[PDB]
């Protein structure tokens, strides 16, 4: 006396942020990807966009997109009681400090 | 993301993309995310895990 029944199947992930590399192989071979070095070669300035399909939420929700860059401080003391730090970020900047 | 939206519009200007790495993304809830644009939000009424 088992009733007719259909599968529902799903997954969860918690504490994970999705990762889409920027590589041709989709895998790391160094921290500076091979497609970051092909825009060094030539660039006309390209404009990005994405679309996303997100499941409905009764609650208000936000999307958080992280664009993975380099944020590197070079910091030096040339004399006693002196500190000077230059801040360089690569493709994004958004009014980046000390440029 | 408005309530009950199924599409999110993204807009990024023309920029050099030299030394770009991946993308990473996750979805949050509005009430569970404080704004760091100011040092006090009178609309952050959530004290749970951010």
């Amino acid at each position: 006396s088992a009733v007719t029944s259909v599968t529902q199947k799903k997954f969860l992930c918690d504490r994970v942020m999705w990762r889409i590399p920027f590589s041709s192989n989709f895998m790391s071979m160094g921290a500076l990807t091979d497609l970051g070095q092909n825009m060094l070669y030539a660039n006309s300035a390209h404009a990005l966009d994405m679309n996303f399909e997100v499941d409905p939420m009764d609650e208000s929700t936000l999307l958080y997109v992280v664009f993975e860059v380099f944020d590197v401080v070079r910091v030096h003391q040339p004399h006693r009681g002196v500190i000077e730090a230059v801040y360089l970020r690569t493709p994004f900047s958004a009014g980046n400090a000390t440029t | 993301i408005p309530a009950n939206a199924t599409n999110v519009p993204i807009s990024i200007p023309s920029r050099n993309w030299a030394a770009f790495r991946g993308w990473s993304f996750t979805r949050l809830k509005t009430k569970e995310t404080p704004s760091l644009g100011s040092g006090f939000d009178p609309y952050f009424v959530y004290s749970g895990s951010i």
Binding site: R19, P21, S28, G30, A31, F70 | R21, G22
Partner: peptide, 26 residues
């Protein structure tokens, strides 16, 4: 790589006659 961590100009060494730490620069 996927998140940065590339650092370190170090190897470490201990001169012989036992392992005797510090060469104190050569």
């Amino acid at each position: 790589d996927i998140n940065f961590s590339s650092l370190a100009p170090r190897h470490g060494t201990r001169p012989f006659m036992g392992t005797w730490s510090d060469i104190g620069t050569s």
